[PDB]
Amino acid sequence: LEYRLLPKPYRFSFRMRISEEIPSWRVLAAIPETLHVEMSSEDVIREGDTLRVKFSLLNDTPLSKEKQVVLFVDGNEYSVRRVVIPPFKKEELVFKVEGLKKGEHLIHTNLNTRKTIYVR
Amino acid sequence: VFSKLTGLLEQILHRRKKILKSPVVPNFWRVPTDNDIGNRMPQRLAIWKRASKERKLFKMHWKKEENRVSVHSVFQLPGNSWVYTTYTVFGNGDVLVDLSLIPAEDVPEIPRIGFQFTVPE
Amino acid sequence: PYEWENPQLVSEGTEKSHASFIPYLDPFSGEWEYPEEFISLNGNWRFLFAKNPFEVPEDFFSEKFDDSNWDEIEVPSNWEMKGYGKPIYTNVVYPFEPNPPFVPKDDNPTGVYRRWIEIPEDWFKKEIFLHFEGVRSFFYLWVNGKKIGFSKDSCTPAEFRLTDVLRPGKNLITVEVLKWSDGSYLEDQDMWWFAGIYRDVYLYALPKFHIRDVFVRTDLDENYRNGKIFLDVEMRNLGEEEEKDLEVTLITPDGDEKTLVKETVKPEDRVLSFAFDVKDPKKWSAETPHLYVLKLKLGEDEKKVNFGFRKIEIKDGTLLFNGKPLYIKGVNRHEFDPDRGHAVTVERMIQDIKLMKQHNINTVRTSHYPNQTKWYDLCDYFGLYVIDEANIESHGIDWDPEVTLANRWEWEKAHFDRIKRMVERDKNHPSIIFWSLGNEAGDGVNFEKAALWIKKRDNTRLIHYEGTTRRGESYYVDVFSLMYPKMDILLEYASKKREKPFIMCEYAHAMGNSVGNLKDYWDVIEKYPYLHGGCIWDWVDQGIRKKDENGREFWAYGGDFGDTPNDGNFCINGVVLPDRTPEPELYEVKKVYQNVKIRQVSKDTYEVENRYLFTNLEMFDGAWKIRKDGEVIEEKTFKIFAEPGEKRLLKIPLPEMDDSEYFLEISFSLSEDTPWAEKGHVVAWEQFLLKAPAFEKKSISDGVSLREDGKHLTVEAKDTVYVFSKLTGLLEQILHRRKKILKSPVVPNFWRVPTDNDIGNRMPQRLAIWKRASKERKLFKMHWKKEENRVSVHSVFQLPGNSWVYTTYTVFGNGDVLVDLSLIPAEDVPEIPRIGFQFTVPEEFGTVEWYGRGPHETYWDRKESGLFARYRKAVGEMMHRYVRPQETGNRSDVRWFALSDGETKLFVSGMPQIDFSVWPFSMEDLERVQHISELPERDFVTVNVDFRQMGLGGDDSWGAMPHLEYRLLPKPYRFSFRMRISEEIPSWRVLAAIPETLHVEMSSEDVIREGDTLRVKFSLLNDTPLSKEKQVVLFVDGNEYSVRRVVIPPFKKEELVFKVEGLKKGEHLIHTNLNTRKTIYVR
Amino acid sequence: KDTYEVENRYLFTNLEMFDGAWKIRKDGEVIEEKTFKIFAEPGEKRLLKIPLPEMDDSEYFLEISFSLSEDTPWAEKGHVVAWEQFLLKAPAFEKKSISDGVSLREDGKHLTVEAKDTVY
Amino acid sequence: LEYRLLPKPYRFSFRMRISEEIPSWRVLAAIPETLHVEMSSEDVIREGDTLRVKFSLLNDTPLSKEKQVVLFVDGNEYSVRRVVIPPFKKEELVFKVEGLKKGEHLIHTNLNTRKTIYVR
Ligand SMILES: [Mg+2]
16 A cells, blocks of 8 residues: 555656756756735534635645645644645635534634634 | 646756756556556556546646746546646746646545656657 | 448548538628639539339440439438338338448438530649538439449548549539448437438539648737637649739738738648747627728639637536636537428528527537538537537437447447538538537547547647446546436536536427426526536427428428338427427526526515626617506616626616505516517516515405206396306306307316326326226215305316315405315325316307416416416417427416406406417317317317416436426315406406305313323314414413424314324413414323 | 735625735835735635845835725725835845954942943 | 633744835745654553553754544544644653554554554
8 A cells, every 4th residue: 555656646756857967966046936815714613513714725825835724723723634735726615614512613724723612 | 938828848958958858757567567567557547547648638828937937737637636736946947847637536545746757868 | 242232342432531611600791701613513413313223224324324314302401201102101110221331222222313514715724623521321422424432421421533534615414312321320319311412512623733721720918818729721732833922911801901821832732730829819709790801812822711710628617618617508400491391591690590599599510410511610600619419310219338339340430420520521610619429429449549630630629428427427528418417416516626518419308388397407407517518309300391281381200201210209309399489488597598688676675686607798789667457657777797706786766656566577678679689578587576466355245146946046146147056066157148158168177288298207007097987977065155246156076086176256246256166186096297277168269368377377386487467368378289289279377367258257356367279179189189279160169277286307207207296296285266257357356255254163171191192182163265274383381392284274173183202290381373272281 | 925815804805896006025114015806795705926136135024905986974995995015125135244343441349341332 | 711721831933024125925935844753552452451642743943833633443543632842842642542452453643654453
């Protein structure tokens, strides 16, 4: 198993130069490296219901990104998704949160996105 | 030199001198070993051989910046898998070459991921 | 081996495929142009017709041969339509034994054509070519006795260089034409089998050195502002030594001229490729068909091509046209005319396009072969999007991977040649947005390879083949296409991220009276992502004009030419009749395809949405109308500025309104003439109710008399006598001033004459019991009850399937009669086709008026195109002649209708509405006859008054049902209406007053033990003369606990039991919505 | 990146009353300013197309603002009533191989580290 | 909640330079950026039992790393941990896998560590 390419998203890059000498393999051209991100949900819900947290990830940069989107609730790691965004492409995700009791609850990621959610 | 009609990098001239003898093409296949023949790999993974030779160009665009130009080519493949290819050329004559591959929900395992091309002997 | 049995051999001696140059269409004048050096070969040819190839006279191709005694035939034509042989219609099965590549040698209709022609002397310093536009299905060519070669594909041209074998003065052209060939196995379309030289022929000459082919493409920038032009020119030398001058001149839509290229070129075979820039060009669309012109001249060789700047792409699954989301509002069209067959004229082609645009259609699919070059030109010029489709269909050969001709090596080069000869011929037309690989011809390597070739050749257009996408996703197409998918499928598609847009290449099968639930498709397409439209099946019924024994014309279908085997009327799938006469169902298309949407914010305030892609609403003349009880009382013009996408508000001042019923209509029409329609043509409209009416009820003080005898009850009121039968419990006769009004009794009626959709889903078998129950019935009981001002006559009737039906007639002093019907179906009966009465009046009654939807026939699932208004027609024009007679004529949502014999009026109002239809023949007549001609003469008119009739359906016509929400499921149903026989038309808003309350008793155990169950009994008596329909709600402690639906017929008690569960210790309030209350204790 | 949707949320004011301006900032300093007007009735949404320059490895940021065309009883011509900013392009980060050395001297109470003309 | 520092691990770095001129904020000194990893488990187990996958992560680099360690089973995302490794420090993790049936199974991570596991 541990030597087989199972059918999931995959990315891959390399640099090529055609020149009279051999350039330093450690040096590369600088490029931007950040994704644009938006989070969005129902700011509220009824005890028992389900919270739907939507995430848009835009990749304006010239390379394939491979990211692990982690959702935290009240500081504790609740869920994670693996994404592969190709260049000049947006990707949308939905997470489903279950079991929130009455009172306010902190929804945040590992992509600098945060939001207080009320439970009537 | 890129082709609008095949969305492939076709030719590289270096001081008016041809470096390619055939385009740079995504390549998913490998020549079956004795082990591969024994476990019917050529039958089971046939769709990846076809996807190494044929591909539809869905879309193709470019974007210039002061110091670089990006050439994107979106390609659907036998078995209905998508493959994205992005070339960035920089002022200093470097080219970055990226490939994403998004397989279709019902395709079997992949022999190989990578590019293939031919140069003079 | 014979050349006409060998699939690997596709032709011989034919020139390579190239773009169309002849005939040219001049966009500025709209006239057809030809080359100077040009000889037509249209007209009379000596013709010989044989049963097979081996019954042809020997040496028939030789000059010396004597043909003086031969028949003369006109070219172009299909020889079935001239007399020779018979036409054959088959759907899927081949008309010969299927064993590819073999065809019969005993039965294979053959046609030889001879013709002498005069070539001028000055032609031979030039190269001479003989051009067939289309032949079916195979032919050989001889010139001056010598064999030149042969060709196989029925719907792409054939071209032969002759310069060597053709002499000055008189030359002989001899053509043998076989009906069936190996080539036939890929031409198994659902259509007629014909044969013969059925498109033009002609000679032309070109210089030794000449332009062989031209490929012009266009790109647009990211803003869709500036353009580029990409020009391929291919030159061909045939013995020219001297250098020649090449000039390429652009001509704008305005008329301005620019030289792009002027250079000298040494004579050689080469392909020259140019790229030009063009600032702010005028972009081609179906709304705005702006054409440019390329003028090319090499020495004395001159050619012209029409192109338009326009870009088709997919962004994130979405289908864009010049940067805007595109919706394919499309139809499938067979090149077919009733008198000529496939040999269709330019005049008829112009008639078709204008009719399409006039009915808001924007796309045509050439089902299922390339058309005459002139079709695509006219789509360029008038403005229609085109799906061009190669001449490949092998339905009759199984699609199993081993069997299918798509996966056989020996059929490879055939598949390839048919696709390549379409692309190369049409590549320059801006109207063509999608290439289609074929139709119902399986899936395999043979289509895969040909597809990939297209995309490397032409990157500017999207590929489409349903054959592959029906088995799931397919890499080598750009568009996901299914035939007649159900809604669920569309909604499933839309539910997940998709890279490819969804298009229905065939949907809403229009066979007979059909095209149901159209709006319901488009409500889903416009709402959900990745759905971009489709093409209706189809445009024109393939009926052949024929004459019967008496000599009265009828439209002929399968098995009307002793042709066996045949698939009958399965070729009659149109929205127009063969002569282009619209079928009512076209008026629903127009309404659902319209490009303006109007929404009611408030009674006065309306929101207009502009759904065109490239047109401002400022181009259209706005009008609104108000109608009082159906007549106009106010009209006012207006203009509204709205860009593509925008919503704008429209304020309408309303008048003070009396107790009448008011309806607002808002329309848009053409400000000035266009090439396709006149000033005042309507392109969109929408209606809205402003105020419902106030209904009067009048206490009647006048009396009614009653006389019983053995076999008849007789009820006199004013000057109208009603006669009931004690023995058949039916209203038999109405005398009005001693004048008979009925020609047959008033009978309950549950049936309708089966449509093509109904036959397809076995309705006649499944629902047989309702047909029997329309003819037979037992009278169980029958009583009457007089009152001072009225008499009621009740008749209880059991029916086949064991269903009960109650009928109550109340006659009032003022000569009104109320007519009620309850129907209680039996626990194990299937769905009901129709609920309503039927009766016959004399034919004298020849003119009908009505306030409802009109003017044309509407049904439960096809009535959005019905405008509410008053209408007047003769009885003869209250039906529609369907090629196979069927259910027809229904009017929906009618307030009132009146029949008139001049003096006497038979008036019928609803309570508050009915559906009706009038015929000049019996239901039995209409079910019997299969052709329009056979519809008999009758001295009476059948009248149908109906609560409702089940939807038409037509999602397909081989199993699909009407949608659940247009089907009468077996539950209790009631229905009433008022009838009056008087010299004038009375006010439909006024009715006789009657009591309207039920008697009710509730009863239970005043107490019970915790855990037990409370049983609450309800008796409901109906003493009144009408059917009641009530919702009995049980409340406990103020909260809604349960509800029952009841239908009480007149003079009947109904008993109900409710079961209450879970009552805890203590007292509990039980009450209804019928003023019944009771405290219940729980020990 | 080049296309922006403006929404007018004034009850009784057309956006034609205001002077539009857009500015592009390279690593904080500006490099391109343009003025524009936009017709939009209360409620309306209108598109705004901004041609972008070719951009080097720097960090680019757009700013779109509306101001007063002429003086008002409560403020002077040019006063800014509304603005919004957007990231156009992230920057490319350089990493440089350092070849030069660093000395170190330990004593009882101190570690001393020398590099160029700075002691830590 | 979405503007509070809740008690979990956190890292944070910056560059400083004392010089006569202001240097380019985009240019930094290059450093190694990889972790050393080892994965280990019972090469097998009985149906019903619990597999215990151990992961060591050594940080020999001069900056604190923040990593999302993801465990895959048969190519599907099973579990994820968030770690913060300070410089010159090894961290140990244990994952518990439950509900492996009879037959061979592929355990792998997003750190280039794989292993076939058997289930008697
Ligand atoms: Mg029809």
